[model samples]
Structures are given as C-alpha cells and as structure tokens.
Target: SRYTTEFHELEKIGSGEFGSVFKCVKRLDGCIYAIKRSKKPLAGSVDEQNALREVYAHAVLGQHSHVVRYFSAWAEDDHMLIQNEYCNGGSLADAISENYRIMSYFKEAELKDLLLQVGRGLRYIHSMSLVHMDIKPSNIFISRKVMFKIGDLGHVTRISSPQVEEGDSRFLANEVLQENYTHLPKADIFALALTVVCAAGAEPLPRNGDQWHEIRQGRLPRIPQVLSQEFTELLKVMIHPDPERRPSAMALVKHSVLLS
Candidate 1:
C-alpha cells in the first residue's frame, strides 16, 4: 500500500473543480512530481468516475514528450492520487498572463514553437482515438524542457458514440454548442484554434452570458492581425464554423507555416 509518507509536499500548484494538484518530492529518489488528488471521497463521489476516466486515458497514451507523463496512481484513503510529471514552468495561461503584457507578446517564432509542440501533442491524442474534451490554454503546460505539454485529462474520453458534453465555455467548439451531439476530433481542433488565439494575446476570451452564445452563430474568434498571413489563415480554418473544414491535428502539425 502507498502512503503520503512516501513523498514530501512542496506547494500547492493547481486547483480546480476536479481536485487539487500539489508539487511534491519523493523520499526515495528525491524526484519532483505533481500529485493530483481528487476533490472528495471516491467511496461516494461523482468525481471518482472522472478520475478513473482520466487515469485510463493517460495510461493508454503512455509516455510521450508532449503529453504529460503519468508515473503512478494510488488511493490515499478515499481520494485518488494521480502522480504525474511536475512542470515547473506552469501552464501556457500562466506564461501568457505574465509574458504577453510586456514590451511584446508570443511572437511568430514562439507561436511556431507553441503550435508545433501542442499540435504534435494533439496529433498523438487524436491518433489514440480519444478526444480531449477540454483543450484550453491552461491545460497546456510548460515544463523544464521549455516545451508545451498537454495535461489535465479530466475530460478525456474514448467515445464509442456521440458524447453530449461541453467543456470550458471559452474554448468550447461551436459543434458542441449546436444541438447536434456528434463529438469528434474536429471539436478538439476547434478548441485548439481558440487556445492558439489565446496564446497569441487575444484578451477577453469568450465567457458565459454575452460572449458564449455568439460562438455558435457562425462567428469565429479573431487571431491577432500582427501574425503572418499564413499563420493567421491557418488559425481561421481551425476555427472554421463548420467542423468538416477544420484541419486534422496531424495536418496542422505538418502545415507549411511551420516550415519556415
């Protein structure tokens, strides 16, 4: 049986509806890790199912450079403890929040870097036949490797059929907003578009009430005009009103814009 005594808590790194993530160091190897503990007792918690879903998805994906590595998982009393890689650089949202407001923002160079890494991660996820129901900026983590790593698989799903579900309001796809419940990889591409837009310094992301409903009205989010026409156009297609037109994650990974 595993115990919290095996690791020392360093600080609270993340918190959300599902649970809390703590930065920790293992007593055995002194290696740092991120421990995601569920919000409530698994014995009688709705979150238990979500926790199991996340664990299975991560296990299936295994270890990859862009996807957050899941080391181990165990039950700490009633709460589930998911021990994964600790990204000291934090989330892309944290990076943009601090770095975007200065003398400059994420340039095409950085944007290329962002797109390639995150896009590759998405490509892998899609290849596994699983949909990352949530692909917002915050879910994209930055590690010591200084590359984008996709984490927080709470909403990950291996769909056998349509899943009538929705994630973050801002990054949600128009397909989901529509009455049709056909969940597909294109929905992730849609969210990735906004996520890329968010990294490019688009402020005032779509929120509930005013900004949310408009997403389904054939309107796409704006990409920063300062970007190259090629890059800007790519984002536009990803944000296409029709999911049929959105590029596959692998296609986006190999897009010519990333060539130069």
Candidate 2:
C-alpha cells in the first residue's frame, strides 16, 4: 500500500515467519527490487528490537558479492518495510522442496556451487566479527543468475553482543541448544551441515523426540550417500560436539570441498 508511486507490488518473492518478500517494480526505469514487510510488530524501543537490528546489520555490511544488497528501511502501516535486492529464483529451501517433490537430488556440481557461494557470504559475515545466528536453506536466496546470496539477516549480531532466538531447532547447533551461541562460527557451520543434508535429498531432521536427541549429541545428521565421501567428511566435523572442532567459515571457503 505504501509504494504506489515509487513502485508497485509485482509478486510475492518468498516468505518466512518473520516477514514476506514482495517483488516491487519501479515505474520509472522498470527496475525490480524486493520489499519485505515485517509480520511481527515492533514491540519495544528502536534501540532494542530485532527489526531494528536487521536494519543495522544490513547497513553495517554492504557490497559483499555473496550478500544481498540492502537499500533502505522505514516503518509504515505498523509493519517495517525493507527494500533490498530482488532475487528471482526464490530460496535454496524452495529449490530443495521442488527437487524432493520430483524425486530429484541436487547434483554434485550444484551442491558444490551453493556451498562455495553461501560459504563465501559467511566468510564475509565473520570477517566483520559478526555471526549469522541463523544459517539454513531458507535464509539462502537464489538470484536471477542462480547464484546463492545470504539473506534474512535479522538474526545476525556481533560476537559479544547477543542465546540467539528460539529459532529453528532442526538446523540449530548443539552449542546453541545446550550452551549458547559462540563467538566463533561453529554454530553456523553446524546448522549449515544440516541444511545441506536436506538439500542432498535427505528428510529434514525432526524437531523433537528421540531421533533428534542423538543427532544433537554430536551425531551428524543422516547425510545422504549421494554426496561424495569427501563432502560427507566435511559435514561430520561441521557438526562436531565441541564447537571449536568445526572449521571457521574462513577456513571452509578454502577447503577442497569447494576449491577442487
């Protein structure tokens, strides 16, 4: 309702619990961008709210190739609206669901490409001494050229500043669930491991019950056999019981898994 002149709502780009992304087309040059409207209300002061944190995070980190470009943010209609780079191909999670629906698995080439791109983004995030706090298929959006760019940055924060949210338990690390989000990128590596298994055509981990408990205790998620032995080993160390054992995102981008 707010962008009638500057832009027009084109279509729903994608959605999640926090907000929904809509494709907005500028009338002047026919440029398209994503406009996200927060589904959750601002319940606190500007300095302490998650929505404001998102604005700060984006403004703080800009122009990384693996990161979606953030433009502007404002409050309107009781919903905070964020304008960002528009991704035409939807999320990595969306691709996984469609692939699973057709009994198709991600090819090694595709999986490798995704890991490198997403890992590159994580590298940049950690370079600034910040943590994504949430890393899963849904937060990795696919651009028009089919490249993965890290998105949904609301949960990102500085190392010393912030248990993290009671977020998606399926991809959450053992440290986060059992202790706390760490200064290192271990928790993200753990969550990233689980996300790849689902991308590899394995079923998503159950959020509760005995099945999840064992995995949370440092057991790796059932990584699909479709991935090569090398890649499989990578997932193991990623979800290791001790957070320090996992490779930092900086180290990850250099590994043969993505390089060779």
Candidate 3:
C-alpha cells in the first residue's frame, strides 16, 4: 500500500475534470513522482470511472519507455490517488503556452524527433490492440531527458472492430463526425497530426462552436509556414478527410520527413 504519507507534495502541476496532479518526492528514496488525485465520488461521477480507466490502461502499458510509467494506485473513502512518473519538463501544451508570443518556436528538426517518438508510442499502443482516443499536446509529456512520453489513457479503448466510437470532436475523423462511427487506429493518426501542428505553435483546428460541422465539411487546420514542405504535407495526409488515407502510425514513423 503506497500510503499518502509516503510522499511530500511539492506543488500542483496540473488540474483537469478528474482532479489535480502534484509533483511529489518520496520519503524513503527521495525519488520524484507525480500524484494524480481524483475528486470525491458522486452519483454521476465520471471522474471516478476515468481515474480507473487511466490506472488500468497505464498498468497494461507500463513497460513501454515511451509511455508514462504507473507506479501504484489506491483509494480513500472520498477520493483516489494514482502515482506515476514525474515528467519535470511538463507537457507539450505547457511548452507551447510558454512560447506563445515568441516567434521562436519548436524547430522542425526537434519537432520531428518528438513527433516520431509519439508515433512510435502510438504504434506500440495499436500493436497492443488499444486505441488512444485522445492524443493531444496536453497528453504528450516530456521527461527530464527531453524524451516525449504518451500519458493520460482515460479515453483509451481496446480495438475489437474497425469502427471507433469515441474521440474528441476537434480531432475526430470526418466519418466519425458524420456519425458513421466507422474508424480504426488511423483515427489516432489524425489526432497525432493535430498534436504535431499544435506543438509547432499553430492552431491545428478551430476551437469555437460547431467545430464538428466544420471538420466534417473538410475544413482543415493549418501548419506553420516555418515548417518544411515535406513535414507540412505529411500532416495534411494524416488528417485527410478519409481515414483510410491516413497512414498507420508505424508507417508514418518511416515517412521521408521522419527519416530525414
């Protein structure tokens, strides 16, 4: 049992619908960790369910270095706690937010490296027959070594069929927005492309109302002009209106842009 008193809270690093995350240090070994604490349970507590899903998925993929490590999970009468690796470098979204106003953004070279790491992680997840329904900047964490790690598996689903039933509207494939509900691991490729665009300091898609309709009608997001044409073209195909046209994550890792 990893007790609450086993670690000392340093600071609140992030917060979400479920609860908040804190940077912590273990009392015994003084090792750093991230503790995700869930809110109190109630009748319609999706928070509790989401926490459990995260714990389960992380446990299943814990051995992968590109995926966030899950150390332990436990519950109290009111809330729950999950201990995972502490990525001191924080999320890609945080990095972008820090450089939002600066013209100097993530260089194409570095972006490619990070994107490839995420692609490999996605390939690993798909190989395990799981779909990461949510792949966004906030879910891509950077370790102290500057390695990109995929985290936040609350929306992960085992792929039993070709039709994917869940995804965020902003990053959903066109067919999904059309209520076709037919999709596959390629749907995640769409989100990964969007994440790459955003990590390059660009708005991958409209965040306003009716984004679903806009996305379904073939309204696509823009890549920063600073990026290479090869990289830009790669993102375009990944977010193609047709999911089948989107390359698999493993295939994308071998793209010319990624290769060079």
Question: Compared with the true structure, what per-residue lDDT tens digits does model 3 show for residues 105-207?
Answer: 7888988998799998999998888888888888889887478999888777667753333556666666655555455688789888878777777664665
Error of 3 at 38 (Å): 1.1
Best by lDDT: 1
Off by over 4 Å in 3: 1-3, 43-45, 161-165, 179-182, 208-220
- The residue pairs that clash in candidate 2, if any, are none
Cα error, candidate 1, residue 206 (Å):
1.8
The global C-alpha lDDT for each of the candidates, from Candidate 1 onward, is 0.78, 0.77, 0.77
| Residue 165 lDDT, candidate 3, scale 0-100 | 38
Relative to the true structure, candidate 1 has a C-alpha RMSD (angstroms) of 2.3
Error of 3 at 259 (Å): 1.4
Q: What 10-residue stretch in candidate 1 is worst by lDDT?
A: 216-225
